[PDB]
Design an enzyme around this catalytic site. Structure first.
Site, PDB file in Angstrom:
ATOM      1  N   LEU A  36       0.817  -1.204   0.000  1.00  0.00           N
ATOM      2  CA  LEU A  36       0.000   0.000   0.000  1.00  0.00           C
ATOM      3  C   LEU A  36       0.859   1.266   0.000  1.00  0.00           C
ATOM      4  O   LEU A  36       1.453   1.628   1.021  1.00  0.00           O
ATOM      5  CB  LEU A  36      -0.936   0.016   1.216  1.00  0.00           C
ATOM      6  CG  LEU A  36      -1.999  -1.097   1.332  1.00  0.00           C
ATOM      7  CD1 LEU A  36      -2.305  -1.405   2.797  1.00  0.00           C
ATOM      8  CD2 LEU A  36      -3.294  -0.803   0.555  1.00  0.00           C
ATOM      9  N   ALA A  47       2.358  -5.801 -11.517  1.00  0.00           N
ATOM     10  CA  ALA A  47       0.923  -5.623 -11.682  1.00  0.00           C
ATOM     11  C   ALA A  47       0.530  -4.165 -11.950  1.00  0.00           C
ATOM     12  O   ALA A  47       1.380  -3.275 -12.044  1.00  0.00           O
ATOM     13  CB  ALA A  47       0.205  -6.236 -10.491  1.00  0.00           C
ATOM     14  N   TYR A  85       2.185  -0.798 -14.389  1.00  0.00           N
ATOM     15  CA  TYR A  85       3.548  -0.308 -14.237  1.00  0.00           C
ATOM     16  C   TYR A  85       4.519  -1.034 -15.164  1.00  0.00           C
ATOM     17  O   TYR A  85       4.094  -1.823 -16.019  1.00  0.00           O
ATOM     18  CB  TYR A  85       3.950  -0.370 -12.765  1.00  0.00           C
ATOM     19  CG  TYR A  85       2.996   0.403 -11.901  1.00  0.00           C
ATOM     20  CD1 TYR A  85       2.836   1.764 -12.093  1.00  0.00           C
ATOM     21  CD2 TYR A  85       2.249  -0.222 -10.905  1.00  0.00           C
ATOM     22  CE1 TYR A  85       1.960   2.489 -11.316  1.00  0.00           C
ATOM     23  CE2 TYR A  85       1.364   0.496 -10.117  1.00  0.00           C
ATOM     24  CZ  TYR A  85       1.209   1.845 -10.348  1.00  0.00           C
ATOM     25  OH  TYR A  85       0.375   2.601  -9.586  1.00  0.00           O
TER      26      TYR A  85
HETATM   27  C1  FMN Z   1      -4.085   3.373  -0.838  1.00  0.00           C
HETATM   28  C2  FMN Z   1      -3.755   2.145  -1.671  1.00  0.00           C
HETATM   29  C3  FMN Z   1      -2.420   1.929  -1.967  1.00  0.00           C
HETATM   30  C4  FMN Z   1      -2.049   0.824  -2.693  1.00  0.00           C
HETATM   31  N1  FMN Z   1      -0.737   0.672  -3.014  1.00  0.00           N
HETATM   32  C5  FMN Z   1      -0.346  -0.410  -3.717  1.00  0.00           C
HETATM   33  C6  FMN Z   1       1.078  -0.662  -3.982  1.00  0.00           C
HETATM   34  O1  FMN Z   1       1.928   0.095  -3.596  1.00  0.00           O
HETATM   35  N2  FMN Z   1       1.423  -1.760  -4.655  1.00  0.00           N
HETATM   36  C7  FMN Z   1       0.496  -2.698  -5.128  1.00  0.00           C
HETATM   37  O2  FMN Z   1       0.907  -3.698  -5.772  1.00  0.00           O
HETATM   38  N3  FMN Z   1      -0.844  -2.516  -4.914  1.00  0.00           N
HETATM   39  C8  FMN Z   1      -1.304  -1.436  -4.199  1.00  0.00           C
HETATM   40  N4  FMN Z   1      -2.678  -1.252  -3.925  1.00  0.00           N
HETATM   41  C9  FMN Z   1      -3.593  -2.290  -4.345  1.00  0.00           C
HETATM   42  C10 FMN Z   1      -3.829  -3.109  -3.037  1.00  0.00           C
HETATM   43  O3  FMN Z   1      -2.600  -3.689  -2.652  1.00  0.00           O
HETATM   44  C11 FMN Z   1      -4.911  -4.211  -3.061  1.00  0.00           C
HETATM   45  O4  FMN Z   1      -4.861  -5.088  -4.193  1.00  0.00           O
HETATM   46  C12 FMN Z   1      -6.229  -3.445  -3.141  1.00  0.00           C
HETATM   47  O5  FMN Z   1      -6.250  -2.479  -2.078  1.00  0.00           O
HETATM   48  C13 FMN Z   1      -7.397  -4.425  -3.086  1.00  0.00           C
HETATM   49  O6  FMN Z   1      -7.235  -5.029  -1.826  1.00  0.00           O
HETATM   50  P1  FMN Z   1      -8.314  -4.773  -0.680  1.00  0.00           P
HETATM   51  O7  FMN Z   1      -9.595  -5.125  -1.350  1.00  0.00           O
HETATM   52  O8  FMN Z   1      -7.973  -5.651   0.517  1.00  0.00           O
HETATM   53  O9  FMN Z   1      -8.082  -3.352  -0.288  1.00  0.00           O
HETATM   54  C14 FMN Z   1      -3.097  -0.126  -3.182  1.00  0.00           C
HETATM   55  C15 FMN Z   1      -4.430   0.106  -2.876  1.00  0.00           C
HETATM   56  C16 FMN Z   1      -4.806   1.176  -2.113  1.00  0.00           C
HETATM   57  C17 FMN Z   1      -6.263   1.385  -1.769  1.00  0.00           C
END
Ligand code: FMN
Length: 379
Positions: free
Chosen positions: A24, A176, A179
């Site tokens: 995140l 993923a 990027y």
């Molecule tokens: C604030 C935010 C930051 C995120 N940063 C990344 C990241 O740095 N790298 C990544 O691969 N995915 C990132 N994601 C995607 C999440 O890792 C994850 O797949 C997405 O939040 C769905 O998961 P959830 O339903 O549990 O939130 C981000 C999502 C959110 C909401």
């Protein structure tokens, strides 16, 4: 009795449970992209998750597309991450650094000498990108020369060297969500005619070269990789995602990596999308041999069903974990979940970051303690 809550053995790492903190971006690095004590508090707080995957961490300035993300390409950055690894380890946690190159999802304003972002091909993503000087349209990025792919691979290798030195338990290659690596995979972004474009094999070549390079620093059982099998996030698209992802997963199966990390199609980067796709986790479980992490839109009950039905081995949570440092305890004791506040995801300070409450205040005290100890130790 929750399978989410069963300790799991990760080729040697004794995970507390089967729950993962998804990576995140929080946009809270110190100056020169260096992690701070506040960053260590945040990770320390969340260290009752079986495995932590960090925010995407750029392997070079060329790899950054959002302000105040942490880097992993300077000594000063490594020193900063040491506070983080220390604090998580004192809390008996496990953590991997997610290595990032944003590709074309950037802006000259972020780039050394105001150079163009780099990509497989000179094709701008649709829409607009936040920069130091407010919102601006995406620029046409510069198509990387054949010879230059080698140098990106070497950035990843240096980045993994830095990671190991910082004390991370392992690394996750971010492949993923639109990027650099992802742009290489899909033929909507990749129009190259060299040995990294064209054929399905060719598009994946870079992914395999990055993996070759990092598995020279970490044992392959400590290199993870994240894929988004079917998403529109950031103007991605491929003419044949079933075929491309089937090959890519089966090859990955043979590299005996730490795990494969799959995001559900119902996630468009950071938000939920209504979307039909069979390219979810059920479709890949058959195709991938080893340890499989499913991520994306899960709740306690739907994550549990994934593990009971043997669909994956680990469930990652992103948004719930932002809000619930002690998500596993909450699951375990059937507690209400703290709600998550999207307005404090990106940028800012303690607020919406380290000030979400625990069930047990002592957990909170212990994170602060380790994070202060980590700072004194690596002063
Ligand atoms: C604030 C935010 C930051 C995120 N940063 C990344 C990241 O740095 N790298 C990544 O691969 N995915 C990132 N994601 C995607 C999440 O890792 C994850 O797949 C997405 O939040 C769905 O998961 P959830 O339903 O549990 O939130 C981000 C999502 C959110 C909401």
């Amino acid at each position: 009795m929750l399978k989410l809550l069963e300790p799991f053995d990760l080729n040697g790492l004794e995970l507390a449970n089967r729950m993962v903190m998804a990576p995140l971006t929080r946009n809270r690095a110190g100056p020169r992209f260096v992690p701070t004590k506040m960053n260590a508090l945040y990770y320390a707080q969340r260290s009752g998750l079986g495995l932590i995957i960090t925010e995407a961490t750029q392997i070079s300035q060329q790899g950054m597309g959002y302000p105040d993300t942490p880097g992993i390409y300077t000594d000063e950055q490594v020193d900063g991450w040491r506070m983080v690894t220390e604090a998580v380890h004192r809390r008996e946690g496990c953590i991997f650094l997610q290595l990032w190159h944003v590709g074309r999802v950037s802006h000259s304003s972020f780039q050394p000498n105001g150079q163009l972002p780099v990509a497989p091909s000179a094709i701008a993503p649709e829409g607009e990108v936040m920069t130091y000087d407010g919102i601006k349209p995406f620029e046409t990025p510069r198509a990387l020369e054949t010879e230059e792919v080698a140098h990106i691979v070497e950035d990843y290798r240096k980045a993994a060297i830095n990671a190991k030195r910082a004390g991370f338990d392992g690394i996750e290659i971010h492949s993923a969500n639109g990027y650099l690596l992802h742009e290489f995979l899909e033929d909507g972004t990749n129009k190259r005619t060299d040995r990294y474009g064209g054929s399905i094999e060719n598009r994946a070549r870079i992914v395999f070269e990055v993996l070759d390079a990092v598995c020279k620093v970490y044992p392959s059982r400590r290199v993870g990789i994240r894929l988004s099998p079917d998403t529109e996030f950031m103007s991605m698209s491929d003419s044949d995602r079933p075929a491309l992802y089937s090959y890519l997963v089966q090859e990955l199966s043979r590299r005996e990596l730490a795990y494969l990390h799959l995001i559900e199609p119902r996630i468009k980067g950071n938000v939920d999308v209504e979307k039909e796709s069979s390219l979810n986790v059920e479709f890949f479980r058959p195709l991938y041999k080893g340890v499989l992490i499913t991520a994306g839109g899960y709740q306690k009950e739907t994550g549990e069903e994934r593990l009971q039905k043997q669909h994956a081995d680990l469930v990652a949570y992103g948004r719930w974990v932002i809000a619930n440092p002690d998500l596993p305890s909450r699951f375990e004791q059937n507690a209400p979940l703290n709600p998550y506040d999207r307005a404090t995801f990106y940028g800012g300070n303690e607020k919406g970051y380290t000030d979400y409450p625990f069930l047990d205040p002592r957990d909170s005290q212990e994170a602060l303690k380790e994070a202060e100890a980590a700072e004194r130790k690596w002063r």
